[PDB]
């Protein structure tokens, strides 16, 4: 016990002295020194296991053993931290690289109708795209594979792999400026999607990076790399960029689950009674929507208010179907009753959980434009249990969204000739024309 403390104190004090200087050695001229310090650390772990076993291993006293097991886990963690601190000094270079990989990939588009330097083979474009990072990777990974002990190397490589995957995801696949250029209002450009050719090229650059990080078994196992959540996330974002309009729309309804649990800063409310009929005549689904009334409409307007309620169904396979209904209008009435019953058809195939009603109140305005007063979403997953529901839907100013709703939306907006996508994008991109009671909601 007395001696295990000695060991612990000395070896942690070593680990600490190293850890404290470690970052100062992580500069580009001394790459070996961090590797050596990591190897020292790891050599402590190895020599400590020897010493633990020399201290009788399993036959050591329980508190001495506990002390040394503690010490070994702490030292393991020091090595993980050092590996992270080391991998982190490469992050700016990996970001610069991946931005350059992005500058190169911007020149590749949907190249079946573009010149042979960009309808250059999927392989050659992947190699060009990769060149900034492969100058980094080949040299460094081959140096580390030498000078790092195999435990040190694997830890360094995991921290570098993650860093590359995440950097590529952020910098290439989901660049924040594509909020600006077709999620957002900033430019009437088609943004240009990741085109099938740039989806390829990237998927091949990634298989090459994976092979690089695998390094024929000298690096990370193919199994770690394939199961990598970093890679899986990157693949997911990529998969979205080619996905069909209905599948994007289904994905939106299935993912935007939170568009059905309380609008924040409401602009009124709508009483609906809704009857899902798994249509007793067909086994399709039909959705009866009795629009009973609206109430508390924040729209004391500069004129004759003439509210009516648009009801829209949303979900997959609606091109052939009446997506929209509206109530009659009511003059000068912030609490207009309607008692009007509509009947959407869903698809036969997609279940009610693939669909949502979107209920919109609008002021009827000839000569002008019919102003959106507010919007509410009802998820038909709820009705899949309820069968029929009376509910007072609070009305919002805009529909509230996650990254995947906003990603699907910026993807669908690039399909700027698909009429279903156009109407979907238009429909989700409908917000309360602010005035007579206010502009921006809460989520």
């Amino acid at each position: 016990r007395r001696f295990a403390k000695t060991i612990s104190n000395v070896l942690l004090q070593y680990a600490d002295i190293v850890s404290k200087d470690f970052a100062s050695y992580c500069s580009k001229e001394k790459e070996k020194v961090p590797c050596i310090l990591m190897n020292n650390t790891q050599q402590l772990r190895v020599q400590l296991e020897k010493m633990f076993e020399a201290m009788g291993g399993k036959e050591l006293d329980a508190e001495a053993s506990g002390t040394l097991k503690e010490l070994q886990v702490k030292l393991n963690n020091v090595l993980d931290e050092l590996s992270h601190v080391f991998a982190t000094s490469f992050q700016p270079h990996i970001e610069e690289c991946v931005r350059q990989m992005g500058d190169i990939l911007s020149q590749v588009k949907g190249t079946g109708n573009v010149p042979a330097s960009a309808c250059s083979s999927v392989a050659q474009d992947a190699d060009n795209v990769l060149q900034p990072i492969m100058d980094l990777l080949d040299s460094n990974l081959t140096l580390f594979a030498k000078i790092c002990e195999k435990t040190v190397l694997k830890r360094v490589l995991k921290e570098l792999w993650k860093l590359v995957m995440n950097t590529m995801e952020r910098t290439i696949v989901l660049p924040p400026e594509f909020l600006s250029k077709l999620k957002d209002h900033m430019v009437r450009e088609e943004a240009k999607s990741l085109t099938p050719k740039q989806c390829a090229v990237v998927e091949l650059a990634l298989d090459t990076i994976k092979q690089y990080f695998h390094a024929g078994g000298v690096g990370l196992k193919k199994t770690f790399l394939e199961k990598s959540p970093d890679l899986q996330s990157l693949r997911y974002a990529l998969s979205l960029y080619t996905q069909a309009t209905d599948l994007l729309i289904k994905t939106f309804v299935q993912t935007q689950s939170a568009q059905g649990s309380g609008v924040e800063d409401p602009v009124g409310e709508v009483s609906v009674h809704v009857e899902l009929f798994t249509h007793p005549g067909t086994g399709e689904q039909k959705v009866t929507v009795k629009v009973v009334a609206a109430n508390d409409l924040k729209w004391q307007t500069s004129g004759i208010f003439r509210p009516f309620i648009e009801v829209n169904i949303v979900g997959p396979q609606l091109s052939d179907k009446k997506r929209k209904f509206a109530t009659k209008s009511k003059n000068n009435s912030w609490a207009p009753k309607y008692n009007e019953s509509f009947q959407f058809s869903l698809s036969a195939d997609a279940g009610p959980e693939c669909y949502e009603l979107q209920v919109c109140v609008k002021d009827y305005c000839f000569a002008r434009e019919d102003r959106t007063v507010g919007l509410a979403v009802l998820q038909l997953r709820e009705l899949a249990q309820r069968g029929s529901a009376a509910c007072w839907l609070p009305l919002g100013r805009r529909i509230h969204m996650d990254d995947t709703g906003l990603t699907v939306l910026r993807i669908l907006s690039q399909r700027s000739n698909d009429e279903v996508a156009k109407e979907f994008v238009k429909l989700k991109s409908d917000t309360r024309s602010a005035e007579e009671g206010g502009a921006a909601p809460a989520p």
Binding site: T251, T255, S257, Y355, R381, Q385, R386, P394
Partner: protein, 600 residues
């Protein structure tokens, strides 16, 4: 292992010369050519007035009434008679017909002797040599078979009444060939205990131990009857134990049989018989050997041939419970059992004991339930003319009452356990596992019914209740499971956006103070479970429709557990008030609906 090897030698001996292809006795009417005593009842055959039947082939002699009590093999009887009369050529001719019968048997059904060999893991060589040895053991006839026999007459149970008193004075005569001995008489008792030992020398395994139970009439009417009939001591019943069905130290309840049509007979006699056979010293009883055979054959068929799978035999009718295997394996146990006097109910209780280990396996609970309904029907109903309870008649089981009671208790417990996780152990996604669940309960019923009917238990744990508790236990564990896995389950089963199907935190696959969504999701899962119980498990478990409705019990337990939890949760939300008024109203509507749909 020592029993396994001997059972193998005996099973080959049994099956090389099977009883099913024994020769029938060719009985001519015969006038006794010397003063003769009937080979079965020992009455004097002499002259025209006491003609018997003489089998031409075997020269066994009996009364006409006795010819059918002679289960003694005609060819072995013929070899013996020919020997006892010095007719050696006839003896050898019969040894040749016995050889040809064994060659026919091997040639016709080699797969029997191969399956014995594989069941007992013997080599083909040691099999062929042991086969040659058992062929010789059968051709020793009984000229080279001899034994000492120590017959302790232990007790009888359930004897008939023949006295003016409405009881009897039972005693036993034990006869073994040339020698007749008698127990002392027990007076006025239909369940007499003698505990009396006789020693006999038997030079012939086709002799029969005639254990006859008699009412000791010393009166004038007996002294009159003695002139006309040879069994004055008013016959209470017999057992005729074939000496080939004796092995080692036996302890056996024999049901008593009718000698004559005027015999009224009931009850059983417990006989402890030690047999010291030449060349078969210290051997186990044929019940224990049969158990060993059946167990090895079962473990061979199930584990070795079928990799663990219990191959249920194709068998139908009121004898289906007597079929345990395919034909070859069936013939092994049946010829062993028939040659060695092992009663069908013992075979069944044994096979039920085998099946009780493999009760989880598909269809087995149905077979076991059926088998136990038959074992039940056997002890419960058979012969109302007995003056003995079903439990006492079952205490006369050679399987052992205790053993079967314990077996049933262990099984009942194993069934209780598996039923306490019935959803997991019998997933609705497998109809066959639902049918096994059904038959698991039908077996539990059959056990409870056996406890009620055969054991005559006054308060067996009522099957419906036992199951209802199991269902409760499962529902509790289900409730826990869903209550720990709520988001995964809900995400998967209902969520229309795939991005929401995944592993939301355990504290949200469980209760949150910040949002009600767990409870909403839990309600839908509770519904899914109640519906699965209503829809799958309630039809499955319709055995006690007036006492067990799984959908009701599911709704009650699930609501109860939910309601306690929800009540604490709402109390907690009432303190914090982090969710909005509207949300509690929506939850209220859902809870209202849930309650009103399933609970109200």
């Amino acid at each position: 292992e020592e029993l396994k090897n001997h059972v193998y030698k005996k099973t080959l001996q049994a099956l090389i010369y099977p009883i099913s292809c024994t020769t029938p006795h060719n009985f001519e009417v015969w006038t006794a050519t010397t003063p003769t005593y009937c080979y079965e009842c020992e009455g004097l055959l002499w002259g025209i007035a006491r003609q018997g039947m003489r089998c031409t082939e075997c020269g066994v002699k009996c009364h006409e009434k006795c010819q059918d009590l002679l289960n003694a093999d005609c060819l072995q009887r013929a070899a013996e008679k020919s020997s006892k009369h010095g007719a050696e050529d006839r003896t050898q001719n019969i040894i040749m017909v016995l050889k040809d019968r064994m060659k026919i048997r091997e040639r016709n059904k080699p797969e029997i002797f191969e399956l014995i060999q594989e069941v007992f893991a013997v080599t083909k060589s040691a099999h062929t040599q042991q086969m040659k040895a058992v062929k010789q053991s059968v051709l020793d006839g009984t000229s080279k078979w001899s034994a000492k026999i120590s017959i302790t007459v232990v007790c009888a149970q359930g004897l008939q009444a023949k006295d003016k008193t409405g009881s009897s004075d039972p005693y036993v005569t034990v006869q073994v060939g040339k020698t007749k001995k008698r127990t002392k008489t027990i007076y006025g008792n239909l369940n007499p205990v003698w505990e009396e030992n006789f020693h006999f020398e038997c030079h012939n395994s086709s002799d029969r131990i005639k254990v006859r139970v008699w009412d000791e009439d010393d009166d004038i009417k007996s002294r009159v009857k003695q002139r006309f009939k040879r069994e004055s001591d008013d016959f209470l019943g017999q057992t005729i134990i074939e000496v080939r069905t004796l092995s080692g130290e036996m302890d056996v309840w024999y049901n008593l049989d009718k000698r004559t049509d005027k015999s009224a007979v009931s009850g059983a006699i417990r006989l402890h018989i030690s047999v010291e056979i030449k060349g078969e010293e210290k051997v186990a009883p044929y019940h224990v050997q049969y158990t060993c055979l059946h167990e090895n054959l079962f473990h061979f068929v199930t584990d070795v041939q079928n990799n663990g799978v219990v191959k249920i035999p194709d068998a139908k009718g009121d004898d289906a419970w007597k079929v345990y295997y395919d034909e070859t394996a069936q013939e092994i146990v049946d010829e062993f059992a028939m040659r060695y006097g092992v009663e069908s109910i013992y075979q069944a209780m044994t096979h039920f004991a085998c099946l009780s280990s493999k009760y989880m396996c598909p269809g087995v609970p149905a077979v076991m339930s059926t088998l136990l309904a038959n074992i039940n029907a056997y002890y419960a109903h058979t012969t109302a003319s007995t003056n003995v309870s079903a439990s006492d008649r079952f205490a006369a089981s050679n399987f052992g009452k205790e053993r079967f009671v314990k077996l049933l208790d262990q099984l009942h417990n194993s069934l209780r356990i598996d039923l306490s996780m019935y959803r997991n152990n019998f997933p609705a996604s497998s109809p066959e596992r639902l049918q096994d669940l059904k038959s698991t309960v039908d077996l539990l019923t059959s056990i409870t019914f056996f406890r009620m009917k055969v054991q005559e238990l006054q308060s067996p744990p009522r099957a419906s209740q036992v199951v209802k508790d199991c269902v409760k236990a499962c529902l509790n564990s289900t409730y826990e499971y869903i209550f720990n896995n709520c988001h995964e389950l809900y995400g998967r089963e209902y969520q229309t956006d795939p991005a929401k199907k995944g592993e939301v935190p355990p504290e949200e696959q469980g209760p949150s103070i910040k949002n009600l969504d767990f409870w909403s999701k839990l309600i839908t899962l509770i519904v899914s479970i109640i519906e699965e119980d209503k829809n799958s498990y309630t039809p499955c478990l319709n055995q006690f429709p007036q006492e067990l409705n799984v959908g009701k019990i599911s709704a009650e337990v699930m609501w109860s557990l939910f309601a306690q939890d929800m009540k604490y949760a709402m109390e907690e939300h009432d303190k914090h008030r982090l969710c909005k008024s509207a949300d509690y109203m929506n939850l209220h509507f859902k809870v209202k609906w849930l309650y009103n749909e399933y609970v109200a």
